[PDB]
Amino acid sequence: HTITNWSGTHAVRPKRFFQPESVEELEKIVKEAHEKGQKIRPVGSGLSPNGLAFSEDGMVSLALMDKVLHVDKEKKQVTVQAGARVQQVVDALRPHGLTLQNFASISEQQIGGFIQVGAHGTGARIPPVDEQVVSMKLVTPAKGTIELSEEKDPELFRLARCGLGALGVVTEVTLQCVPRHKLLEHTFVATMKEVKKNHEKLLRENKHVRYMWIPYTDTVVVVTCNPLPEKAPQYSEDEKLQPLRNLLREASPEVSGLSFTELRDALLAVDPLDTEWVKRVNQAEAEFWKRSEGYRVGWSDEILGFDCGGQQWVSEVAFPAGTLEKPSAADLEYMEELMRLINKEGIPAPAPIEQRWTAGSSSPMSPAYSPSPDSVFSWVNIIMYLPTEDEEQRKAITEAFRQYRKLCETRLWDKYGAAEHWAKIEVPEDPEELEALRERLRKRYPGVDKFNKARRELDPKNILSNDMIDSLFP
Numbered sequence: 001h002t003i004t005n006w007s008g009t010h011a012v013r014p015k016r017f018f019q020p021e022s023v024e025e026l027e028k029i030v031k032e033a034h035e036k037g038q039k040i041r042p043v044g045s046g047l048s049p050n051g052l053a054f055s056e057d058g059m060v061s062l063a064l065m066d067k068v069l070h071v072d073k074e075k076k077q078v079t080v081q082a083g084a085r086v087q088q089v090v091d092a093l094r095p096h097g098l099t100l101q102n103f104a105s106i107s108e109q110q111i112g113g114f115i116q117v118g119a120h121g122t123g124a125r126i127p128p129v130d131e132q133v134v135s136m137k138l139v140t141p142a143k144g145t146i147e148l149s150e151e152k153d154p155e156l157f158r159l160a161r162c163g164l165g166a167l168g169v170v171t172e173v174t175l176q177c178v179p180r181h182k183l184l185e186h187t188f189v190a191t192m193k194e195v196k197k198n199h200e201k202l203l204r205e206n207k208h209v210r211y212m213w214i215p216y217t218d219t220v221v222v223v224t225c226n227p228l229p230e231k232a233p234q235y236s237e238d239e240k241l242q243p244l245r246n247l248l249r250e251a252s253p254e255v256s257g258l259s260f261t262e263l264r265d266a267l268l269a270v271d272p273l274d275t276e277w278v279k280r281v282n283q284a285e286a287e288f289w290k291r292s293e294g295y296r297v298g299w300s301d302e303i304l305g306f307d308c309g310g311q312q313w314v315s316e317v318a319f320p321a322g323t324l325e326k327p328s329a330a331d332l333e334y335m336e337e338l339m340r341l342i343n344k345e346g347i348p349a350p351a352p353i354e355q356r357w358t359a360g361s362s363s364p365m366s367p368a369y370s371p372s373p374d375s376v377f378s379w380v381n382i383i384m385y386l387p388t389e390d391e392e393q394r395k396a397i398t399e400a401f402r403q404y405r406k407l408c409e410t411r412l413w414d415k416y417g418a419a420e421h422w423a424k425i426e427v428p429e430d431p432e433e434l435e436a437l438r439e440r441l442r443k444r445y446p447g448v449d450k451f452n453k454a455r456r457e458l459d460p461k462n463i464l465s466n467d468m469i470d471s472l473f474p
């Protein structure tokens with residue numbers, strides 16, 4: 001079994017690959033893996049953009065353990081085997097009239113890999129998915145199967161539920177659900193100025209708010225979602241795509257089939273590191289979005305999904321933007337600086353730069369860790385696309401993205417106290433940078449020392465961790 005992430009930027013062929021169908025079977029696997037000092041890193045769907053779960057030596061998947069065990073019809077709660085995919089849990093929950101509190105744009109993630117990185121959606125009053133776990137069962141190399149909750153070692157619970165697969169193998173999760181609801185989704189464009197005006201009130205008046213920023217333009221695409229009490233409040237598809245189709249014809253039945261995202265991919269392909277060419281692609285996409293204002297209605301699960309496009313490099317940071325009651329302007333200032341920089345340094349940055357918001361997490365490891373609840377994090381995701389399979393063109397884009405991320409890395413993350421998403425962080429080779437990174441992790445995470453202490457307490461032989469984990473927590 002050879003195993004590759006979504007963007008095929010990372011792949012691994014583990015010497016050992018285990019896929020147990022029962023806790024009993026997994027209990028054994030770790031017991032024996034412990035007894036022998038053999039690596040077994042937990043893996044979910046393997047989709048993490050940075051290969052977090054990848055180990056040459058050994059990996060365990062709970063893909064076959066994916067049943068919904070119990071529904072508490074009253075406390076609005078599902079207990080689910082860790083191997084269940086988000087999609088699988090949305091389907092099972094449907095007839096029980098329940099849904100998850102939030103979704104992370106794709107739904108192929110396993111609950112394990114979903115919670116272990118503190119995945120998030122958007123919505124200023126909605127935490128990342130760590131704060132959605134009531135209880136978990138975790139299989140430890142040292143203590144065996146232990147039950148965690150706000151009651152059973154709540155100190156460990158919060159450190160475990162977001163443990164980057166390093167504190168044990170999660171077998172069960174009880175999740176705080178909300179009632180299955182339809183959602184009204186509003187898409188519109190705006191200027192920086194128009195954003196700044198309605199921003200503070202927009203976050204607070206709208207359940208979900210996401211901004212797609214389009215570099216080398218003053219077009220920001222805003223997407224609000226709110227529950228439909230009772231329903232929905234024009235350009236043709238051909239007319240929406242005309243600018244991108246017209247731009248590609250400059251440099252057909254080949255074209256007429258391509259989706260909006262295939263056109264971007266096919267446009268970027270032409271010359272993805274020439275900044276002037278990207279200027280033109282981004283302007284055309286801005287026009288598309290200008291021709292795509294409107295409303296949709298659907299179930300939260302259908303609406304909070306987002307088509308992310310082709311294979312890609314991405315980097316998302318979570319940084320503090322005050323509290324509900326004391327608004328901050330870090331979030332829009334962050335964006336101003338970043339768009340000042342891309343122009344100043346001639347970065348061939350395609351669209352979109354995705355800015356979202358979450359409530360704080362009580363999970364020490366969450367990149368939106370706050371002691372104060374009703375705190376607010378802005379998340380900002382940068383992207384370069386890999387439109388083709390030319391390893392040549394794919395290594396220039398890899399270069400340029402590292403430089404793009406590196407420039408944010410210095411100029412912004414320190415200033416704003418920005419912590420990287422656990423699924424997107426890349427361990428740099430240059431030993432300067434790795435020590436540079438390490439001092440930043442300490443700087444942004446108080447619970448670090450306590451996290452390696454739980455690693456020795458629960459996995460003293462270190463069979464659950466890979467190079468990545470060792471390099472980040474030395």
Ligand SMILES: Cc1cc2nc3c(=O)[nH]c(=O)nc-3n(C[C@H](O)[C@H](O)[C@H](O)COP(=O)(O)OP(=O)(O)OC[C@H]3O[C@@H](n4cnc5c(N)ncnc54)[C@H](O)[C@@H]3O)c2cc1C
Pocket residue numbers: 006007041042043044045046047048049051052053062082083103104105106108109110111112113114116117118119120121164165166168169170171308423
């Ligand atoms: C196209 C795309 C869009 C995305 N959008 C979002 C988004 O909107 N929001 C967001 O927050 N993230 C997003 N992500 C990132 C994604 O949520 C994470 O990569 C997620 O962790 C993937 O889940 P997985 O099951 O594939 O995890 P894997 O990559 O398989 O594993 C993730 C982590 O969990 C551990 N693990 C997995 N299963 C278990 C288990 N049973 N017990 C213990 N540890 C376990 C692994 O060791 C690893 O540390 C996106 C990724 C892609 C590719």
Ligand SMILES: O=C1O[C@H]([C@@H](O)CO)[C@H](O)[C@@H]1O
Pocket residue numbers: 105308312314316352354381383
């Ligand atoms: O990993 C991710 O990929 C998407 C991004 O590519 C948006 O274009 C999600 O928003 C998330 O940040």
